[PDB]
Amino acid sequence: YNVGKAEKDGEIRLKNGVAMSKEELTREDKNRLRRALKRKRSKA
Amino acid sequence: YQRFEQAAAFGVIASNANCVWIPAPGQLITSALEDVNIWDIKTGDLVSKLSDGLPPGASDARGAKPAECTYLEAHKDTDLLAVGYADGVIKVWDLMSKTVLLNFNGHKAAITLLQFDGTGTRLISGSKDSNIIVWDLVGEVGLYKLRSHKDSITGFWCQGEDWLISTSKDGMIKLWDLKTHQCIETHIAHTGECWGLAVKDDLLITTGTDSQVKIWKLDIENDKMGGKLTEMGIFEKQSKQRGLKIEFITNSSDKTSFFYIQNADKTIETFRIRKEEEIARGLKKREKRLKEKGLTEEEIAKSIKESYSSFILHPFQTIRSLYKIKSASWTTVSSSKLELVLTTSSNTIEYYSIPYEKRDPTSPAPLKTHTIELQGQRTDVRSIDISDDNKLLATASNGSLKIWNIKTHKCIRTFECGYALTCKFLPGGLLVILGTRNGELQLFDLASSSLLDTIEDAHDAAIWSLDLTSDGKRLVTGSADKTVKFWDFKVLKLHHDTTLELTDDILCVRVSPDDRYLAISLLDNTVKVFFLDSMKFYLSLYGHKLPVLSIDISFDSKMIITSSADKNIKIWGLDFGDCHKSLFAHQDSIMNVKFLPQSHNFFSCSKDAVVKYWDGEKFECIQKLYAHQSEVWALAVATDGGFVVSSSHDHSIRIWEETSLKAGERLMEALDLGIAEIEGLEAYNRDMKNAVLIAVNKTPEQYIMDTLLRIRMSQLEDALMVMPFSYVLKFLKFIDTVMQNKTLLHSHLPLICKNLFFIIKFNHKELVSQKNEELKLQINRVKTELRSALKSTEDDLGFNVQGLKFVKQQWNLRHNY
Amino acid sequence: GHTNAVQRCSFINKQKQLISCGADGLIKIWDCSSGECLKTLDGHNNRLWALSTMNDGDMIVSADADGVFQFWKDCTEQEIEEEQEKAKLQVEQEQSLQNYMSKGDWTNAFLLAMTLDHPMRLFNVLKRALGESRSVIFNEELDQAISILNDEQLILLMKRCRDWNTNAKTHTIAQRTIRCILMHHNIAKLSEIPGMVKIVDAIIPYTQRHFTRVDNLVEQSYILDYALVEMDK
Structure with a gap:
């Protein structure tokens, strides 16, 4: 077994083993996570 | 080149901001774009004008449009006025000194509401960025920020230090503990946006987008983990539009309570709060009515709960204004009458007085007592012209024509007209001619202060353009009937002379200063030049992608400029019709361009709210003027060229006058600091029987431990090898x-x-060498608990592996073939 | 938008909407102002000839050619009331949650995080509750709380517990919650729960690795003895 993408659409689950549910994110946190996803796809 | 600066600004009474009433009907404070105006209601004259400075057009002046005032709040006791701007800047103004005292910059968006605390020492500010910031006036700092909301703050209530109630555009009601800087309760006010919030004792009212109005009780001391805010009922106001503002006022003599709900439309709806005895009397009465209708007792109780709102509130009176209302405020509360003051979107101030007796008012409609109307125009100015003497400025707008003194900035005369489109002075500055959208041509005299002649059938459609010859005896008019008509002045009346019908509608008509050429703009994006003497066709200018809006000819009748909606200015040589250069001057449609007299330089205005100064020979932008808040509809230049006047969609007429430690090394500091504290406390305790740590608010143990964490894993071992053995002993301690x-x-x-364990590895030889008894007990101790603490983990995880294996085993027996 | 011929048309809700009947057997409710299909009702498997409305379309009757009547009743106001309430409750569940965390009421915070499915708050309730538990298993209240979970919830925890274990810094919490489950639940009942075994399958190989580690940490701890025997000489 290996940690993968979040099963629920409303959550972000990283390979670190941490699930990250949107409703409880702060706005600043969402921005950096969004930008973090930009970099990953950009290199992808 | 010389620099142009905004000499003066006028024509604005009340901009897009709230109104603040100060007792002496008393004076009123209203916003004027970047400036604040103080008006005397009785006289209707401007008392004073607040301007920060830095006039537009100066070198030090910023190259961006000024931030317009969004909210005005004044503390009556301290006479301190706070101004909120669209950029999120709060400026504290000394009313007596009329100067800025403080400047706070903590919001990234327009400020929506300002409120002084009761004592006046702290200012709470809400902005469109969804943030509430509480400022300390004496400290000149922002104490803390409240950030739970997710949209623009529409309204908030804070009369006590302990608690704050806030409303936002996202429609939640949030109760705050000012001591904890946290939100305690969150409730959905309405299905969509919540715009109004007003609080009186436990009674609270909020307004949504629809006519629904909610009524709540506030038990601040309820303290049941919830229910501090509980809904009572819903009442529907007559106006279907959203309720922008709600405020309360109480009568000291009779303890009577009133409030209004300021709607987005032209209606203000006032309400009265019934006294408790009235509510009981009504409750008993309606019970009699319901019982008479035969309803069951349980149905009556439910109906009473359903009609709970009706008992408390009474629709008192509805105020109707001719124009959409921008803001309103109570002025005076008395048994005899109730008075209200409001500002409209159409740039005027209206004072209303409501005489009343007991439950209902005496008069069917409110009494309009005072209006400040002379110094502003309701409709945006479409054309402006300057008299030859350069003393009188004519401003033509839809429905009215107003004329001002440039020196005093005060309107001299006002004339009622149709939908004004183009206006020009006649020679001598004593007459004005106006071209309306209805095809009518109007002439006025300043001395007579009346309209002499009107030509109803001057054109079948809008007279878009109007120009006069240098002699002043021949008038040229362009209209949507695709015709140009020439008129003569005979003693004064106008007589049609000749008709020049064109293939398309005409936008602008210009006559050369020498009266030799006539240039006309058509919707087909071509400009046609004619010879005025003989009306023979001369040239057909082509190259504009959108229709040409304005045309201007140089004083020498050599150069001609064309400005079109395609955002381009084209300079043409009239000798052969050749475009010397095409300039992408502005970011939007360019409405007007004018030559400076006796020079080829020219100005340009566009919908981007920017006026640009250009060189006709070098074709370069000399200066950019950022003062307009909206589209610039007309432009005019003085005959001498000393000053330029521009008017925009903001109802503002302004005059432009020519004037390090590394891993390990950091640790060594950490062990020194923390253990020095640890040893001191140990010594201090034994006898009984720092700034850094205090600033970080961590124990000595956490502080060093955190420093250990920050070290990267590849860099822990090298950092620790650098450590001398002396620092190892502090590490062991x-x-x-x-x-x-x-x-x-x-x-x-x-x-x-x-x-720990590498450290023992690296310098084992030295560690074993020492005979120190205190070290011998430490090593024994740290060993034992390290085993127990570790053994605890192994027992717990060595546990869960086993029985879960049993769980796996049990399922196999039942469900495995 | 009708696949087949439209054969009955009647305005409902006064001017605002239209209901239409097609030979396909589908009832489409359109917005007259926008001319767009707001809703589609499929209560028939054959052609429709007749359409009757009552109270401005509050009640609609459609008679299939086979002879089936579909009595449609308006329930929009019923639904939006339901939508309003659950949103109201969900907001309260949020508001109650962060307040408990600030107060440290982990036993109540745990149950709210069950319903709201907030993994960070779950890990934060469990993590700092453990720290207090350091200061039978966690605490009597939370230990009772974990026992009462229904099988839907039990699966949810062990999904998260599976996730935390894979990381070597969050596994201490993970085996840690798993132990208490085995203390306060019938191990038999756990087995039959569908899909639990597969989650229960993935948890061993990570735990067993954690035996290989930690156990080694005991081995290289006795350097303190070897230090402690040499010095004594």
Whole structure:
């Protein structure tokens, strides 16, 4: 077994083993996570 | 080149901001774009004008449009006025000195509401960025920020230091503890946006987008984990539009309570709060009515709960204004009458007086007592012209024509007209001619202050353009009937002379200063030049992608400029019709361009709210003027060229006058600081029987432990090898002290193991050498708990592996073939 | 938008909407102002000839050619009331949650995080509750709380517990919650729960690795003895 993408659409689950549910994110946190996803796809 | 600066600004009474009433009907404070105006209601004259400085057009002046005032709040006791701007800047103004005292910059968006605390020492500010910031006036700092909301703050209530209630555009009601800087309760006010919030004792009212109005009780001391805010009922106001503002006022003599709901439309709806005796009397009465209708007792109780709102509130009176209302405020509360003051979107101030007796008012409609109307125009100015003497400025707008004194900035005369489109002075500055959208041509005299002649059938459609010859005896008019008509002035009346019908509608008509050429703009994006003497066709200018809006001819009748909606200015040589250069001057449609007299330089205005100064020979933008808040509809230049006047969609007429430590090394500091504290406390305790740590608000143990964490894993071992053996002993003492804090122990057990145990590895020889008894007990201690703390983990995980294997085994027996 | 011929048309809700009947057997409710299909009702498997409305379309009757009547009743106001309430409750569940965390009421915070499915708050309730538990298993209240979970919830925890274990810094919490479950639940009942075994399958290989580690940490701890025997000489 290996940690993968979040099963629920409303959550972000990283390979670190941490699930990250949107409703409880702060706005600043969402921005950096969004930008973090930009970099990953950009290199992808 | 010379620099142009905004000499003066006028024509604005009340901009897009709230109104503040100050007792002496008393004076009123209203916003004027970047400036604030103080008006005397009785006289209707401007008392004073607040301007920060830095006039537009100066070198030090910023190259961006000024921030317009969004909210005005004044503390009556201290006479201190706070101004909120669209950029999120709060400026504290001294009313007596009329100067800025403080400047706060903590919001990234327009400020929506300002409120002084009761004592006047702290200012709470809400902005469109969804943030509430509480400022300390004496401290000149922002104490703290409240950030739970997710949209623009529409309204908030804070009369006590302990608690704050806030409303936002996202439609939640949030109760705050000012001591804890946290939101305690959150409730959905309405299905969509919540715009109004007003509080009186437990009674609270909020307005949504629809006519629904909610009524709540506030038990601040309820303290049941919830229910501090509980809904009572819903009442529907007559106006279907959203309610922007709600405020309360109480009568001291009779303890009577009133409020209004300011709607987005032209209606203000006032309400009265019934007294408790009235509510009981009504409740008993309606019970009699319901019982008479035969309703069951349980149905009556439910109906009473359903009609709970009706008992408390009474629709008192509805105020109707001719124009959409921008803001309103109570002025005076008395038994005899109730008075209100409002500002409209159409740039005027209206004072209303409501005489009333007991339950209902005496008059069917409110009494309009005072209006400040002379110094502003309701409709945006479409054309402006300057008299030859350069003393009188004519401003033509839809429905009215107003004329001002340039020196005093005061309107001299006002004339009622149709939908004004183009206006020009006649020679001598004593007459004005106006071209309306209805095809009518109007002539006025300043001395007579009346309209002499009107030509209803001057054109079948809008007279878009109107120009006069240098002699002033021949008038040229362009209209949507695709015709140009020439008129003569005979003693004064106008007589049609000749008709020049064109293939398309005409936008602009210009006559050369020498009266030799006539240039006309058509919707087909071509400009046609004619010879005025003989009306023979001369040239057909082509190259504009959108229709040409304005045409201007140089004083020498050599150069001609064309400005079109395609955002381009084209300079043409009239000798051969050749475009010398095409300039992408503005970011939007360019409405007007004018030559400076006796020079080829020219100005340009566009919908981007920017006026640009250009060189006709070098074709370069000399200066950019950023003062307009909206589209610039007309432009005019003085005959001498000393000053330029521009008017925009903001109802503003302004005059432009020519004037390090590394891993390990950081640790060594950490062990020194923390253990020095630890040893001191140990010595201090024994006898009984720093700034850095205090600033970080961490114990000595956490501080060093955190420093250990920050070190990268590849860099821990090299950092620790650098450590001298002396610092190892402090490290061992540190680890020993961690042992007592078993919470920290289990939190970072693997790291403590790795670092401690290498250290023993690296300098084992030196460590074993010492005979120190105190070291001998430390090593024995740290050993034992490290085993127990570690053994606890192994027991718990060595546990869960086994029985779960049993769980796996049991399922196989039942469900495995 | 009708696949087949439209054969009955009647305005409902006064001017605002239209209901239409097609030979396909589908009832489409359109917005007259926008001319767009707001809703589609499929209560028939054959052609429709007749359409009757009552109270401005509050009640609609459609008679299939086979002879089936579909009595449609308006329930929009019923639904939006339901939508309003659950949103109201969900907001309260949020508001109650962060307040408990600030107060440290982990036992109540745990149950709210069950319903709201907030993994960070779950890990934060469990993590700092453990720290207090350091200061039978966690605490009597939370230990009772974990026992009462229904099988839907039990699966949810062990999904998270599976996730935390894979990381070597969050596994201490993970085996840690798993132990208490085995203390306060019938191990038999756990087995039959569908899909639990597969989650229960993935948890061993990570735990067993954690035996290989930690156990080694004991081995290289006795350097303190070897230090402690040499010095004594």
